[PDB]
Design a protein around this nucleic acid. Structure first.
Lengths: 218, 225, 26
RNA sequence: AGGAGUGGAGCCUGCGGCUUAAUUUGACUCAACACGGGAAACCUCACCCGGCCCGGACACGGACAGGAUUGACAGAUUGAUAGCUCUUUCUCGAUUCCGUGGGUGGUGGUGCAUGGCCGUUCUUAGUUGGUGGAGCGAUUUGUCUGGUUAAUUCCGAUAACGA
RNA sequence: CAGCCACCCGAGAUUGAGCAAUAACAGGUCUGUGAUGCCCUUAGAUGUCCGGGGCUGCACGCGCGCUACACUGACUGGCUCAGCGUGUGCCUACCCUACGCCGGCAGGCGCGGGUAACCCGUUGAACCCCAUUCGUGAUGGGGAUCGGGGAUUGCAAUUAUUCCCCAUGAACGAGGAAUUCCCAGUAAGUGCGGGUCAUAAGCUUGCGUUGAUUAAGUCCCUGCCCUUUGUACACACCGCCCGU
């Protein structure tokens, strides 16, 4: 049984928030994975990208921890990446799944050429950066699939991107930086100002303001 | 026939040790956990605790009678004054001997030693113990031997509470490549009214009863009876 | 299942290290 | 500050060189050398000699039902009272003998393949999660400039808080 | 503030130990293991059997204590007092000590006091309050080195290992550079029960016993820790590495 700890968690549990998009619209930090389980926890698939043993030198031996890099996301419009380090591999994977749920971002999908049907690719060329690793996503024609390395391909497929060209530069052999750079590129899709987003924003009531009475009275 | 009290006490302790050694060498395959002794005027009974009661009994109840005659013949006591019962443990989770033997017989049968250790740790933590550690030492991968640990919960290692709050069990697994040492430390939880754990708390633990919320009086309001 | 996880934690940099790390997910 | 007073100078288990058959070794700073709870004729005896039962159960071959040990005084003599081995054959009744092993036992080795137990770091005051913050990351903070305490003991400061 | 230093009071204003964390050492123990793996085994043995056989053998130094150096005491006795505890046996024969006598000694025989604080024992132990010598010493202390006499568990005590009397008896004026352990019933001097053991201690342990001034501080000689810092070390300075 989920007992919310934050105001956003209370609003989500009490069915005051009707989708993840109202939370995204106000950039509110999601600090409970149960919110993500509530909103997408019927289509989310997890995948451990890597288990990496890191070591800290000590007086009488090397202390070894394991870092789990886990990608998550329903294969439509949402993806997250989580990196968690712990002394136990199972605990690391559990923490990484929780962290990937906490970092799920909306993915903007667009059209390569003409706009028949549902969006299938990235709206424009986006670039993500992480420690000398540069990952570029380029819109591709329908039916080409993901033209990428396996590590960015996993995240692009979990993001719902049907087809996309990619370019990589740097030390992509470091899976963590590669994954974080492609996650940055994916998350920059909705932060890009395209001419279809020039329409003035019609501000609405924030969840904390539109259900302030419910929070007070519950 | 009789001897002074100190010598009789040490002899009874020796007999208890002999009994426990023979039993743990015999019935550890049947999930043997522990033994105890009761003494009545001119009579002595010995009780056992083991997980699989039907397996430890055997067929026709032959093993109990056979072993009883064995101990009666071993220790030279007056015949017919020894009887051995058939009892099961309160739980196999909070007993260090039982879980040590479970790990032992998971190890002998052929299984990744760390899988068995992980399984025993999970079984302990679903049993409700306040914490444990298990150490499996020996030759696992290669010719060198590295002692290997697993801990969960919290364990205390000092003071008087370790006398009753911590149960210690050391055992050996015999393997074709070598002998594996298994040490198990279990921490019983604060368990009054049932004595599965200690009836007394940790001496450093102070608990405060919550204040009771009552209506603060304003004026004397009494009713005649 | 957890057999690979457990045998990996015994020897993180042993002979059976890349094999087990790959067997976890690849 | 010094106090029993150290090695000092005879006589200690003890160690180290110690021929001889072996003076046996195991253990070289504190963390070996009155240690192995070691003041030893015998159980401390491991090591130098001659005998004691083979502690040999499956396969396969012998006199194959009479196969072979204890039989105080003399004789074969590293015991004449161990017939231990002899021309003689001085005694239970067939579980005694030999060969490829076999299951055996070795205070025989490897503690530098392992257990457990102990010593030691270290009986000082150290050690580590969870959530949060920082870093791409290994990691870091918490676990600190100070005061205080026997003490990471607690104050206090404080991106840490709570353990 | 957390605390510290004094005083009133109080038995006590810091009693002493036991346990004692991460993570480790190729530390020790295959001579505890009937816990043991793999080579050495498989009778020309790698055991109890005679115990017959030995660390009780020697040209010097390191390594844990006592006697000693005295007029700080050996010394005749006048003596008044301990604590901890093992103690007559389902193969466990080995037990601590009084009545009468003998003998300097080891012991003896009748029941023997012991299922316990009844028995040892109001544990009549060490120094000192005194009593001849020494009155300032190599001797009477140091009997440490060689004679001879006895008993109780020993099949055997030779290399008297084990327990008493007689005499010839040796440096010994603060003991080498250099060092070990020490804070209040404490360093020490003394006896007792054990692991020792067939009575068995020069070791250790535990116990009392009479019992002490420098010390209430600090970081020098010695170390361990912490922080900063440097690193080409990470098998981690017993590292790494250069050239002939």
């Amino acid at each position: 049984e989920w007992m919310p700890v934050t105001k956003l968690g209370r609003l989500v549990k009490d069915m005051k928030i009707k989708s993840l998009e109202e939370i995204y619209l106000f950039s509110l930090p999601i600090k409970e994975s149960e919110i993500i389980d509530f909103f997408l926890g019927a289509s989310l698939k997890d995948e451990v990208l890597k288990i990496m043993p890191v070591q800290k030198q000590t007086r009488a031996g090397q202390r070894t921890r394991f870092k789990a890099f886990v990608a998550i996301g329903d294969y439509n419009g949402h993806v997250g990446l989580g990196v968690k380090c712990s002394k136990e591999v199972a605990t690391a994977i559990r923490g990484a799944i929780i962290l990937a749920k906490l970092s799920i971002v909306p993915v903007r999908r667009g059209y390569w050429g003409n706009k028949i049907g549902k969006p299938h690719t990235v709206p424009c060329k986006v670039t993500g950066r992480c420690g000398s690793v540069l990952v570029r996503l380029i819109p591709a024609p329908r039916g080409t699939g993901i033209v990428s390395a396996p590590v960015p391909k996993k995240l692009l497929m979990m993001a719902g991107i049907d087809d996309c060209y990619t370019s990589a530069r740097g030390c992509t052999a470091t899976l963590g930086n590669f994954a974080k750079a492609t996650f940055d590129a994916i998350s920059k899709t909705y932060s890009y100002l395209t001419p279809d987003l020039w329409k003035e924003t019609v501000f609405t009531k924030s969840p904390y303001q539109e259900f302030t009475d419910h929070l007070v009275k519950t | 026939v009789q001897i002074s009290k100190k010598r009789k006490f040490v002899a009874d302790g020796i007999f208890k040790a002999e009994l426990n050694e023979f039993l743990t060498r015999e019935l550890a395959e049947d999930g043997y956990s522990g033994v105890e002794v009761r003494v009545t005027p001119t009579r002595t009974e010995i009780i056992i605790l083991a997980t699989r009661t039907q397996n430890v009994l055997g067929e026709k109840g032959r093993r109990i009678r056979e072993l009883t005659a064995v101990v009666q013949k071993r220790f030279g006591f007056p015949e017919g004054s020894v009887e051995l019962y058939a009892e099961k443990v309160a739980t196999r989770g909070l007993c260090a001997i039982a879980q040590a033997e479970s790990l032992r017989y998971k190890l002998l049968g052929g299984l990744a030693v760390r899988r068995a250790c992980y399984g025993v740790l999970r079984f302990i933590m679903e049993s409700g113990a306040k914490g444990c550690e298990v150490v499996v030492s020996g030759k696992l991968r290669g010719q060198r031997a590295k002692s290997m640990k697993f801990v969960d919960g919290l364990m205390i290692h000092s003071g008087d509470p370790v006398n009753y709050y911590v149960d210690t069990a050391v055992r050996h697994v015999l393997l074709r490549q070598g002998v594996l040492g298994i040490k198990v430390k279990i921490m019983l939880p604060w368990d009054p009214t049932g004595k599965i754990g200690p009836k007394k708390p940790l001496p450093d633990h102070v608990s405060i009863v919550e204040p009771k919320d009552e209506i603060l009086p304003t004026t004397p309001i009494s009713e005649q009876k | 299942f957890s057999e690979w996880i457990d045998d990996l934690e015994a020897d993180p940099k042993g002979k059976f290290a890349q094999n087990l790390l790959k067997k976890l997910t690849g």
